[PDB]
Coordinates of C-alpha atoms and ligand atoms in Angstrom, one line a residue:
Chain A
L7 CA 0.0 0.0 0.0
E8 CA 0.8 3.7 0.4
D9 CA 1.3 4.4 -3.3
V10 CA -1.9 6.3 -2.8
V11 CA -0.6 8.5 0.1
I12 CA 0.0 12.2 0.0
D13 CA 2.0 13.9 2.8
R14 CA -0.5 15.9 5.0
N15 CA 1.5 19.1 4.5
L16 CA 0.5 19.1 0.9
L17 CA -3.2 19.5 1.8
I18 CA -5.1 22.6 3.0
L19 CA -8.5 21.8 4.3
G20 CA -11.2 24.5 3.9
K21 CA -14.9 24.5 4.7
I22 CA -17.2 21.5 5.0
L23 CA -19.2 20.8 1.9
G24 CA -21.4 18.4 3.8
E25 CA -21.4 16.5 7.2
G26 CA -22.6 13.0 7.7
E27 CA -22.4 10.6 10.6
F28 CA -19.5 8.3 9.6
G29 CA -17.8 11.0 7.6
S30 CA -17.5 14.6 6.5
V31 CA -16.6 16.1 3.1
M32 CA -14.6 19.4 2.9
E33 CA -13.2 21.5 0.2
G34 CA -9.4 21.7 -0.1
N35 CA -6.3 22.6 -2.1
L36 CA -3.8 19.9 -3.0
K37 CA -0.2 20.9 -3.9
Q38 CA 0.6 18.8 -6.9
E39 CA 3.8 17.3 -8.2
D40 CA 4.3 20.2 -10.7
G41 CA 4.0 23.0 -8.2
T42 CA 0.4 24.0 -9.0
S43 CA -2.4 23.6 -6.5
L44 CA -5.5 21.7 -7.5
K45 CA -9.0 22.2 -6.0
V46 CA -9.9 19.0 -4.3
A47 CA -12.7 17.5 -2.2
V48 CA -11.7 15.6 0.9
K49 CA -13.9 13.0 2.6
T50 CA -12.8 12.3 6.2
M51 CA -13.8 8.7 6.8
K52 CA -14.5 7.2 10.3
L53 CA -13.5 3.6 10.4
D54 CA -14.1 0.8 13.0
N55 CA -10.7 1.3 14.8
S56 CA -11.4 -1.6 17.2
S57 CA -10.0 -3.8 14.4
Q58 CA -8.3 -3.3 11.1
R59 CA -11.0 -4.9 8.8
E60 CA -12.2 -1.4 8.0
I61 CA -8.7 0.2 7.7
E62 CA -7.2 -2.7 5.8
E63 CA -10.1 -2.8 3.3
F64 CA -9.9 1.1 3.2
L65 CA -6.4 1.3 1.9
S66 CA -7.0 -1.7 -0.3
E67 CA -10.0 -0.3 -2.0
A68 CA -8.2 2.9 -2.7
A69 CA -5.2 0.7 -3.7
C70 CA -6.9 -0.4 -6.9
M71 CA -9.1 2.7 -7.2
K72 CA -6.0 4.6 -8.0
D73 CA -5.3 2.3 -10.9
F74 CA -8.7 3.1 -12.4
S75 CA -8.9 5.4 -15.4
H76 CA -12.2 6.4 -16.9
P77 CA -13.8 9.7 -17.8
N78 CA -17.1 8.5 -16.2
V79 CA -15.5 7.3 -13.0
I80 CA -14.3 9.9 -10.5
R81 CA -10.6 9.8 -10.0
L82 CA -9.0 9.0 -6.7
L83 CA -6.1 11.4 -6.3
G84 CA -4.8 9.9 -3.1
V85 CA -5.3 9.4 0.7
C86 CA -4.0 11.2 3.7
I87 CA -3.2 10.0 7.2
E88 CA -3.7 12.4 10.1
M89 CA -3.1 11.5 13.7
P95 CA -5.8 8.6 13.6
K96 CA -8.1 9.5 10.7
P97 CA -8.0 8.7 7.0
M98 CA -9.3 11.0 4.3
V99 CA -9.8 10.5 0.5
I100 CA -8.9 13.2 -2.0
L101 CA -10.9 13.6 -5.2
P102 CA -10.9 16.5 -7.7
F103 CA -13.3 19.2 -6.7
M104 CA -16.3 19.6 -9.1
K105 CA -18.0 23.0 -8.8
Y106 CA -21.1 21.6 -10.5
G107 CA -21.9 19.1 -7.6
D108 CA -24.0 16.0 -7.7
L109 CA -26.5 15.3 -10.5
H110 CA -29.5 14.9 -8.2
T111 CA -29.2 18.5 -6.9
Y112 CA -28.5 19.6 -10.5
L113 CA -31.8 18.1 -11.7
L114 CA -33.7 20.0 -9.1
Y115 CA -32.0 23.3 -9.9
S116 CA -33.0 22.9 -13.6
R117 CA -36.6 23.2 -12.4
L118 CA -35.9 26.8 -11.3
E119 CA -36.1 29.7 -13.7
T120 CA -32.9 31.1 -12.2
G121 CA -31.2 27.7 -12.3
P122 CA -29.6 25.9 -15.3
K123 CA -31.8 25.8 -18.5
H124 CA -34.5 23.2 -18.9
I125 CA -32.6 20.0 -19.6
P126 CA -33.7 18.5 -22.9
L127 CA -34.5 14.8 -23.2
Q128 CA -31.3 14.3 -25.2
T129 CA -29.1 15.6 -22.4
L130 CA -31.0 13.5 -19.9
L131 CA -30.2 10.4 -22.0
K132 CA -26.5 11.5 -22.3
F133 CA -26.6 11.7 -18.5
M134 CA -27.6 8.1 -18.3
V135 CA -25.2 7.0 -21.1
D136 CA -22.4 8.5 -19.0
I137 CA -23.3 6.7 -15.8
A138 CA -23.7 3.4 -17.8
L139 CA -20.2 3.9 -19.3
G140 CA -18.8 4.4 -15.9
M141 CA -20.7 1.3 -14.6
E142 CA -19.7 -0.9 -17.6
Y143 CA -16.0 0.0 -16.9
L144 CA -16.6 -0.8 -13.2
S145 CA -18.3 -4.1 -13.7
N146 CA -16.0 -5.4 -16.4
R147 CA -13.4 -5.2 -13.6
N148 CA -15.8 -7.0 -11.2
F149 CA -16.2 -3.9 -9.0
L150 CA -19.4 -3.6 -7.1
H151 CA -20.6 -0.1 -6.2
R152 CA -23.5 -0.8 -3.8
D153 CA -24.7 2.8 -3.5
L154 CA -25.7 3.7 -7.0
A155 CA -28.0 6.8 -7.0
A156 CA -28.2 10.2 -8.6
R157 CA -27.0 11.8 -5.4
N158 CA -23.8 9.8 -5.9
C159 CA -23.1 11.0 -9.5
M160 CA -20.9 14.0 -10.0
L161 CA -20.9 16.6 -12.7
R162 CA -17.4 17.2 -14.1
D163 CA -16.7 20.7 -15.5
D164 CA -17.4 19.6 -19.0
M165 CA -20.9 18.6 -18.0
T166 CA -20.2 14.9 -18.3
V167 CA -21.2 12.6 -15.4
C168 CA -18.8 10.5 -13.4
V169 CA -19.8 7.7 -11.0
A170 CA -18.8 8.1 -7.4
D171 CA -19.6 6.5 -4.0
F172 CA -20.0 8.9 -1.0
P193 CA -31.4 3.8 0.5
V194 CA -33.9 1.0 0.6
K195 CA -35.7 2.4 -2.5
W196 CA -32.5 1.8 -4.6
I197 CA -31.9 -1.8 -3.3
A198 CA -32.8 -4.7 -5.5
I199 CA -35.6 -7.1 -4.2
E200 CA -33.1 -10.0 -4.1
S201 CA -30.9 -7.9 -1.8
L202 CA -33.6 -6.9 0.6
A203 CA -34.7 -10.4 1.7
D204 CA -31.4 -12.2 1.1
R205 CA -28.3 -10.3 2.0
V206 CA -26.6 -10.5 -1.3
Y207 CA -25.2 -8.0 -3.9
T208 CA -24.1 -9.0 -7.4
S209 CA -23.5 -6.7 -10.4
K210 CA -27.2 -7.3 -11.2
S211 CA -28.0 -5.4 -8.0
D212 CA -26.1 -2.3 -9.2
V213 CA -28.1 -2.7 -12.5
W214 CA -31.2 -2.4 -10.4
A215 CA -30.0 0.8 -8.7
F216 CA -29.1 2.0 -12.2
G217 CA -32.8 1.6 -13.2
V218 CA -33.9 3.8 -10.2
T219 CA -31.1 6.3 -11.0
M220 CA -32.5 6.3 -14.6
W221 CA -35.9 7.0 -13.2
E222 CA -34.6 9.5 -10.7
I223 CA -33.1 11.3 -13.8
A224 CA -36.1 10.9 -16.1
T225 CA -38.2 12.6 -13.4
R226 CA -35.6 15.4 -12.8
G227 CA -35.3 14.5 -9.1
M228 CA -38.5 12.9 -7.9
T229 CA -38.1 10.6 -4.9
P230 CA -38.6 7.0 -6.0
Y231 CA -41.9 5.4 -5.4
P232 CA -44.2 8.3 -4.5
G233 CA -46.9 7.3 -2.1
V234 CA -45.0 4.2 -1.0
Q235 CA -43.3 4.2 2.4
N236 CA -39.8 2.8 3.1
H237 CA -40.9 0.0 5.3
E238 CA -43.4 -1.2 2.7
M239 CA -40.8 -1.6 -0.1
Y240 CA -40.3 -5.4 0.0
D241 CA -44.0 -6.0 0.1
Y242 CA -44.5 -3.6 -2.8
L243 CA -41.7 -5.1 -4.8
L244 CA -42.5 -8.8 -4.1
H245 CA -46.2 -8.3 -5.1
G246 CA -44.6 -7.4 -8.5
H247 CA -45.0 -3.6 -8.5
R248 CA -42.3 -1.4 -10.1
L249 CA -41.4 2.2 -10.6
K250 CA -43.8 4.0 -12.9
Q251 CA -43.5 5.4 -16.4
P252 CA -43.0 9.2 -16.0
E253 CA -45.4 11.6 -17.7
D254 CA -43.5 12.1 -20.9
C255 CA -40.9 9.4 -20.7
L256 CA -40.2 7.6 -24.0
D257 CA -41.7 4.1 -24.3
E258 CA -38.3 2.7 -25.4
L259 CA -36.5 4.5 -22.5
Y260 CA -38.9 3.2 -19.9
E261 CA -38.6 -0.4 -21.1
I262 CA -34.9 -0.1 -20.8
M263 CA -35.2 1.0 -17.2
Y264 CA -37.9 -1.6 -16.5
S265 CA -35.5 -4.4 -17.7
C266 CA -33.3 -3.3 -14.8
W267 CA -35.9 -4.4 -12.3
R268 CA -36.7 -7.9 -13.5
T269 CA -37.4 -10.2 -10.6
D270 CA -34.5 -12.5 -11.4
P271 CA -31.0 -11.0 -11.4
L272 CA -29.8 -13.1 -14.3
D273 CA -32.7 -12.0 -16.5
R274 CA -31.5 -8.4 -16.2
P275 CA -29.1 -6.9 -18.8
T276 CA -25.5 -6.1 -18.1
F277 CA -24.1 -2.6 -18.0
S278 CA -22.4 -3.2 -21.3
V279 CA -25.8 -4.1 -22.9
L280 CA -27.6 -1.2 -21.3
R281 CA -24.9 1.3 -22.3
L282 CA -25.4 0.4 -26.0
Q283 CA -29.2 0.4 -25.8
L284 CA -29.1 3.9 -24.5
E285 CA -26.5 5.0 -27.0
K286 CA -28.7 3.6 -29.8
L287 CA -31.8 5.3 -28.4
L288 CA -30.0 8.6 -27.9
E289 CA -28.7 8.7 -31.5
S290 CA -32.3 7.9 -32.8
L291 CA -33.3 11.4 -31.4
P292 CA -32.4 14.7 -33.1
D293 CA -30.0 17.1 -31.6
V294 CA -30.6 19.3 -28.5
Chain B
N5 CA -71.3 20.9 28.1
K6 CA -71.3 20.3 24.3
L7 CA -68.5 17.8 24.6
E8 CA -71.4 15.3 24.2
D9 CA -72.8 17.1 21.1
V10 CA -69.4 16.3 19.5
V11 CA -68.8 12.8 20.9
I12 CA -69.9 9.8 19.0
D13 CA -70.6 6.5 20.8
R14 CA -67.8 4.0 20.1
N15 CA -70.2 1.2 19.0
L16 CA -71.2 3.3 16.0
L17 CA -67.7 3.0 14.4
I18 CA -65.9 0.2 12.7
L19 CA -62.1 0.5 12.3
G20 CA -60.4 -0.7 9.1
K21 CA -56.9 -0.7 7.8
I22 CA -54.2 2.0 8.1
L23 CA -54.1 4.9 5.7
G24 CA -51.0 6.3 7.4
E25 CA -49.2 6.2 10.6
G26 CA -47.4 8.7 12.9
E27 CA -45.8 8.3 16.3
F28 CA -48.2 10.8 17.7
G29 CA -51.1 9.2 15.9
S30 CA -52.3 6.8 13.2
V31 CA -55.1 7.2 10.7
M32 CA -57.4 4.4 9.8
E33 CA -60.3 4.0 7.3
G34 CA -63.7 3.4 9.0
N35 CA -67.4 3.0 8.7
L36 CA -69.5 5.4 10.7
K37 CA -73.2 4.6 11.3
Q38 CA -75.1 7.9 10.8
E39 CA -78.4 9.4 12.1
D40 CA -80.4 8.1 9.1
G41 CA -79.0 4.5 9.3
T42 CA -76.7 5.0 6.3
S43 CA -73.0 4.3 6.8
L44 CA -70.4 6.8 5.6
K45 CA -66.7 6.1 4.8
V46 CA -64.6 8.0 7.4
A47 CA -61.0 8.6 8.4
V48 CA -60.1 7.9 12.0
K49 CA -57.0 9.5 13.5
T50 CA -56.2 8.2 17.0
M51 CA -54.4 10.6 19.4
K52 CA -52.3 9.6 22.3
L53 CA -52.0 12.2 25.1
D54 CA -50.0 11.9 28.3
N55 CA -52.4 11.9 31.2
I61 CA -57.5 15.8 27.3
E62 CA -60.0 18.4 28.3
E63 CA -58.1 20.7 25.9
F64 CA -58.4 18.1 23.1
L65 CA -62.1 17.7 23.8
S66 CA -62.5 21.5 23.4
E67 CA -60.6 21.7 20.2
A68 CA -63.0 19.3 18.5
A69 CA -65.8 21.4 20.0
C70 CA -64.9 24.6 18.3
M71 CA -63.5 22.7 15.3
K72 CA -66.9 21.0 14.8
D73 CA -68.5 24.5 14.8
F74 CA -66.7 25.3 11.5
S75 CA -68.4 24.9 8.2
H76 CA -66.4 25.9 5.1
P77 CA -66.3 23.7 2.0
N78 CA -62.6 24.4 1.8
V79 CA -62.0 23.2 5.4
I80 CA -62.1 19.6 6.4
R81 CA -65.1 18.8 8.6
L82 CA -65.3 17.2 12.0
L83 CA -67.9 14.5 12.3
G84 CA -67.3 13.6 15.9
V85 CA -65.0 12.1 18.5
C86 CA -64.8 8.7 20.1
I87 CA -63.2 7.8 23.5
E88 CA -62.3 4.1 23.8
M89 CA -60.9 2.2 26.8
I94 CA -57.3 3.9 29.6
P95 CA -58.2 6.9 27.4
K96 CA -57.7 6.4 23.7
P97 CA -59.1 9.5 22.0
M98 CA -59.9 9.3 18.3
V99 CA -61.0 12.0 15.7
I100 CA -63.4 11.1 13.0
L101 CA -63.4 12.9 9.6
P102 CA -64.9 12.0 6.2
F103 CA -62.8 9.7 4.1
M104 CA -61.5 11.2 0.8
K105 CA -60.4 8.6 -1.7
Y106 CA -58.2 11.1 -3.6
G107 CA -55.8 11.5 -0.7
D108 CA -53.5 14.4 0.1
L109 CA -52.6 17.1 -2.4
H110 CA -48.8 16.5 -2.1
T111 CA -49.0 12.8 -3.0
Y112 CA -51.5 13.7 -5.8
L113 CA -49.1 16.2 -7.3
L114 CA -46.4 13.5 -7.5
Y115 CA -48.9 11.1 -9.1
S116 CA -49.7 13.6 -11.8
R117 CA -46.1 13.3 -13.0
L118 CA -46.6 9.6 -13.8
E119 CA -48.2 8.1 -17.0
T120 CA -50.5 5.8 -15.0
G121 CA -51.5 8.4 -12.4
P122 CA -53.8 11.4 -12.9
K123 CA -53.4 13.4 -16.1
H124 CA -50.9 16.3 -16.2
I125 CA -52.5 19.1 -14.1
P126 CA -53.0 22.2 -16.2
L127 CA -51.8 25.5 -14.7
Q128 CA -55.4 26.6 -14.3
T129 CA -56.3 23.6 -12.1
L130 CA -53.1 24.2 -10.1
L131 CA -54.3 27.8 -9.6
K132 CA -57.7 26.5 -8.4
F133 CA -55.9 24.3 -5.9
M134 CA -54.3 27.5 -4.5
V135 CA -57.5 29.4 -4.6
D136 CA -59.3 26.6 -2.7
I137 CA -56.6 26.6 0.1
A138 CA -56.8 30.4 0.4
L139 CA -60.6 30.3 0.7
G140 CA -60.1 27.8 3.6
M141 CA -57.4 29.9 5.2
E142 CA -59.4 33.1 4.9
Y143 CA -62.3 31.4 6.7
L144 CA -60.0 30.1 9.4
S145 CA -58.0 33.2 9.9
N146 CA -61.1 35.4 10.0
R147 CA -62.1 33.2 12.9
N148 CA -58.7 34.0 14.3
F149 CA -57.5 30.4 14.1
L150 CA -53.8 29.5 13.6
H151 CA -53.3 26.4 11.4
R152 CA -49.5 26.3 12.3
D153 CA -48.9 23.3 10.0
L154 CA -49.7 24.5 6.5
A155 CA -48.2 22.4 3.7
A156 CA -49.3 20.5 0.6
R157 CA -49.3 17.3 2.6
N158 CA -51.8 18.7 5.0
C159 CA -54.3 19.5 2.2
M160 CA -57.0 16.9 1.3
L161 CA -58.7 16.3 -2.1
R162 CA -62.5 16.1 -1.7
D163 CA -64.2 13.7 -4.1
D164 CA -65.3 16.7 -6.2
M165 CA -61.6 17.6 -6.8
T166 CA -61.8 20.7 -4.7
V167 CA -59.2 21.1 -2.0
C168 CA -59.9 21.5 1.7
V169 CA -57.5 22.5 4.6
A170 CA -56.8 19.9 7.3
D171 CA -54.4 19.3 10.2
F172 CA -52.4 16.1 10.4
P193 CA -41.0 20.9 8.9
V194 CA -38.6 23.7 9.3
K195 CA -38.9 24.6 5.6
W196 CA -42.5 25.8 6.1
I197 CA -41.8 27.9 9.2
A198 CA -41.6 31.7 8.8
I199 CA -38.4 33.4 9.7
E200 CA -39.9 35.4 12.6
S201 CA -41.3 32.1 14.0
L202 CA -37.9 30.4 13.7
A203 CA -36.2 33.1 15.9
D204 CA -38.9 33.3 18.6
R205 CA -41.8 30.9 19.2
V206 CA -44.1 33.7 18.0
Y207 CA -46.7 32.6 15.5
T208 CA -49.5 34.7 13.9
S209 CA -51.7 34.4 10.9
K210 CA -48.9 36.1 9.0
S211 CA -46.9 33.0 9.7
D212 CA -49.5 30.9 8.1
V213 CA -49.4 33.3 5.1
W214 CA -45.7 32.3 4.9
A215 CA -46.4 28.6 4.9
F216 CA -49.2 29.2 2.3
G217 CA -46.5 30.8 0.1
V218 CA -44.4 27.7 0.4
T219 CA -47.5 25.6 -0.2
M220 CA -48.1 27.6 -3.4
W221 CA -44.5 26.8 -4.4
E222 CA -45.0 23.1 -3.7
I223 CA -48.0 23.2 -6.0
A224 CA -46.2 25.2 -8.7
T225 CA -43.4 22.7 -8.6
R226 CA -45.8 19.7 -8.5
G227 CA -44.4 18.3 -5.3
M228 CA -40.7 19.4 -5.1
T229 CA -39.2 19.7 -1.7
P230 CA -38.7 23.4 -0.7
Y231 CA -35.2 24.8 -1.1
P232 CA -33.4 22.2 -3.2
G233 CA -29.7 21.9 -2.2
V234 CA -30.4 23.7 1.1
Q235 CA -30.2 21.8 4.4
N236 CA -32.7 21.8 7.3
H237 CA -30.1 23.3 9.6
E238 CA -28.9 25.9 7.0
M239 CA -32.4 27.4 6.8
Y240 CA -32.5 30.1 9.4
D241 CA -29.2 31.4 8.2
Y242 CA -30.3 31.0 4.6
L243 CA -33.5 33.0 5.3
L244 CA -31.8 35.6 7.4
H245 CA -29.5 36.6 4.5
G246 CA -32.5 37.6 2.4
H247 CA -32.8 34.5 0.2
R248 CA -36.2 33.0 -0.8
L249 CA -37.6 30.0 -2.6
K250 CA -36.7 30.5 -6.3
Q251 CA -39.1 31.0 -9.2
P252 CA -40.2 27.7 -10.8
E253 CA -39.3 27.1 -14.4
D254 CA -42.6 27.6 -16.2
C255 CA -44.5 29.5 -13.5
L256 CA -46.1 32.9 -14.3
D257 CA -44.3 36.0 -13.2
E258 CA -47.4 37.3 -11.5
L259 CA -48.1 33.9 -9.8
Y260 CA -44.5 34.2 -8.3
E261 CA -45.1 37.8 -7.2
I262 CA -48.1 36.6 -5.2
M263 CA -46.2 33.8 -3.4
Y264 CA -43.1 36.0 -2.9
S265 CA -45.2 38.6 -1.0
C266 CA -46.0 35.8 1.5
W267 CA -42.2 35.6 2.3
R268 CA -41.6 39.3 3.2
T269 CA -39.3 39.7 6.2
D270 CA -41.9 41.8 8.1
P271 CA -45.1 39.9 8.9
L272 CA -47.0 43.2 8.6
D273 CA -45.8 43.7 5.0
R274 CA -47.3 40.2 4.1
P275 CA -50.8 40.3 2.7
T276 CA -53.8 38.6 4.3
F277 CA -55.5 35.4 3.2
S278 CA -58.4 37.5 2.0
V279 CA -56.1 39.6 -0.2
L280 CA -54.2 36.6 -1.4
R281 CA -57.5 34.8 -2.2
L282 CA -58.6 37.7 -4.5
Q283 CA -55.2 38.0 -6.1
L284 CA -55.3 34.4 -7.2
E285 CA -58.9 34.7 -8.4
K286 CA -58.0 37.5 -10.7
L287 CA -55.0 35.6 -12.1
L288 CA -57.2 32.5 -12.8
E289 CA -59.9 34.6 -14.5
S290 CA -57.3 36.6 -16.4
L291 CA -56.1 33.3 -18.0
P292 CA -57.9 31.7 -20.8
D293 CA -59.9 28.6 -20.2
Ligands
LIG301 C1 -25.1 16.7 -2.3 N1 -24.5 18.0 -2.0 C2 -25.4 19.0 -1.9 C3 -23.8 17.8 -0.7 C4 -22.3 17.4 -0.9 C5 -21.8 16.6 0.1 C6 -20.4 16.2 0.0 C7 -19.7 16.6 -1.1 C8 -20.2 17.4 -2.1 C9 -19.3 17.7 -3.3 C10 -19.2 19.0 -4.0 C11 -20.1 20.2 -3.9 C12 -20.8 20.8 -2.8 N2 -21.4 21.8 -3.3 N3 -21.2 22.0 -4.6 C13 -21.7 23.1 -5.4 C14 -20.4 21.1 -5.0 O1 -18.3 18.9 -4.9 C15 -17.6 17.7 -4.8 N4 -16.6 17.3 -5.6 C16 -16.0 16.1 -5.4 N5 -16.5 15.3 -4.4 C17 -17.6 15.7 -3.7 O2 -18.1 14.8 -2.7 C18 -17.5 13.5 -2.7 C19 -16.8 13.1 -1.7 C20 -16.3 11.8 -1.7 C21 -16.5 11.0 -2.8 N6 -15.9 9.6 -2.7 C22 -15.9 8.6 -3.8 O3 -16.4 8.8 -4.9 C23 -15.2 7.3 -3.4 C24 -15.1 6.1 -4.2 N7 -14.4 5.3 -3.5 C25 -14.0 3.9 -3.9 N8 -14.0 5.8 -2.3 C26 -13.3 5.2 -1.3 C27 -14.0 4.5 -0.3 C28 -13.2 3.8 0.7 C29 -11.8 3.9 0.6 F1 -11.1 3.2 1.6 C30 -11.2 4.5 -0.4 C31 -11.9 5.2 -1.3 C32 -14.5 7.1 -2.2 O4 -14.4 7.8 -1.3 C33 -17.2 11.4 -3.9 C34 -17.8 12.7 -3.8 C35 -18.2 17.0 -3.8 C36 -21.5 17.8 -2.0
LIG302 C1 -49.5 9.7 1.7 N1 -50.7 9.4 2.4 C2 -50.7 8.0 2.9 C3 -50.8 10.3 3.5 C4 -52.0 10.0 4.4 C5 -51.8 9.6 5.7 C6 -52.9 9.4 6.6 C7 -54.2 9.5 6.1 C8 -54.4 9.9 4.8 C9 -55.8 10.0 4.3 C10 -56.4 9.4 3.2 C11 -55.7 8.4 2.1 C12 -56.0 8.3 0.8 N2 -55.2 7.4 0.3 N3 -54.4 7.0 1.2 C13 -53.4 6.0 1.0 C14 -54.7 7.5 2.4 O1 -57.7 9.7 3.1 C15 -58.0 10.6 4.1 N4 -59.2 11.1 4.4 C16 -59.3 11.9 5.4 N5 -58.3 12.2 6.3 C17 -57.1 11.6 6.0 O2 -56.0 11.9 6.9 C18 -56.3 12.8 7.9 C19 -56.4 12.4 9.2 C20 -56.7 13.3 10.2 C21 -56.8 14.6 10.0 N6 -57.0 15.6 11.1 C22 -57.6 16.9 10.9 O3 -57.9 17.4 9.9 C23 -57.8 17.7 12.2 C24 -58.1 19.1 12.3 N7 -58.2 19.4 13.6 C25 -58.5 20.7 14.2 N8 -57.8 18.3 14.3 C26 -57.8 18.1 15.8 C27 -56.6 18.4 16.4 C28 -56.5 18.2 17.8 C29 -57.6 17.9 18.5 F1 -57.5 17.8 19.9 C30 -58.8 17.7 17.9 C31 -58.9 17.8 16.5 C32 -57.6 17.3 13.5 O4 -57.3 16.2 13.8 C33 -56.6 15.1 8.6 C34 -56.3 14.2 7.6 C35 -56.9 10.8 4.9 C36 -53.3 10.1 4.0

């Protein structure tokens, strides 16, 4: 390990961009190899320090996360050790998460009304990032629009900072395969096609399993294309193996998006 | 002493399944046997109070209301260990907030035209005008607390820091001008068809966000004059805010000024 470690001195921690319970995310400046300072985000992570199963998996996840390279996967820039607390350094993205962005578009003073085409490109991007991740047998386990970042070029990159995003096979059985990510991708798709509606309006959290096991699914949004909804519906098939892979979904959406005219 | 005039004997009521549940109280469907032998579908909210006279006097004055845009009180039951329960007519079309979300789905109710959305607002103002003229304080105004009568008119009912006026955040002060503020937010909920107030702004950020002069932002395809009305509800000084009677007439002009 430690090929992903940056000397603490190199990191200036600013204000908190959001506080959770097992971690906080702050803005920061990283002094790079070439003298320049990059704007970074820094997630302070609280591990179970009674053992090392959290720590040793922590460095080890970042270990191969560093070796990732994909425009639709957020880049790990490194980790810091402060004494003890670990913290993960990613490039800052002024455009924030996609979920918040979808809500902002609904405001006259916010970004322009997102055309259907851009929404599709949003989902193409996420699928590209997921295809890369699954073709390396990497399981995300928190896919949602709140976990998708907007790079400065307005492309989307997958990240990982929720019962309504969890696949029915994962709620009763404790399991998570790539097909489970695919299910969350369907909800993420629906979260995007609705421009930020909470999944399953009128259904409570504790009723999710009963709702899903009786065979009910997320509902076609008011003006969602029929082809687009059948793609997202295939993500929720009762049996994990009957669902498509991210590679297959990525090309369905690419084909659907190119069927539409421009902007 | 007119408690009785409001109370309904327990044996006239049959409790069904849950419509919704809260820690303070849960709501169940019900059948109420009436004066004329017919049974009416009712909602039944059960209230738990630590060891009531107050409760039994709210229902008293609350029964004395009659506005078509206010939900009506049919009676009260007391079941035994006190277990008070409040009986209101059942409305199959549910709450306005959930209904707004349903409009956005193909299978749910058709896309609500701006004029109908305006009527939803007009209806709520009519119910607030009635209640404020009686010098009642709602204190929980929000699209979730508005019911859809079977005639698709809206009534005001009473089952949230983003619906609380800035003067009521600082103090525990609350006046009808505070409800005017929540009505503005409710107007915004309806204009947005169920969005959560202040996207990207956190519950704890709110008082600071409001104290710096920021307000809920104009929805994308919402009329400039409709937004002027809901903005006036958010003025820093409660006295500069309009009354529910003024708001009610503002909305009515806007609706009539629009084509049909
Ligand atoms: C929702 N909003 C309102 C609140 C909010 C809350 C928090 C941050 C941001 C935010 C903003 C931002 C705020 N306002 N605005 C206008 C923009 O900008 C940003 N730019 C970049 N990142 C940001 O937050 C992130 C922090 C961490 C990660 N982390 C990952 O993706 C990981 C993948 N892995 C494998 N690991 C890992 C896990 C275990 C290990 F051991 C090792 C690595 C990871 O840690 C991703 C994003 C932000 C916004
Ligand atoms: C998302 N969904 C599930 C949310 C939801 C949740 C629960 C019920 C309903 C629901 C449904 C319905 C349709 N579909 N589904 C699926 C459900 O239909 C309904 N019809 C009628 N009411 C309903 O809920 C109400 C119950 C009580 C009151 N209460 C009042 O209005 C009071 C005014 N006052 C002064 N007092 C008071 C206060 C103190 C006192 F001491 C005395 C009196 C009051 O108690 C208002 C509404 C429903 C919808």
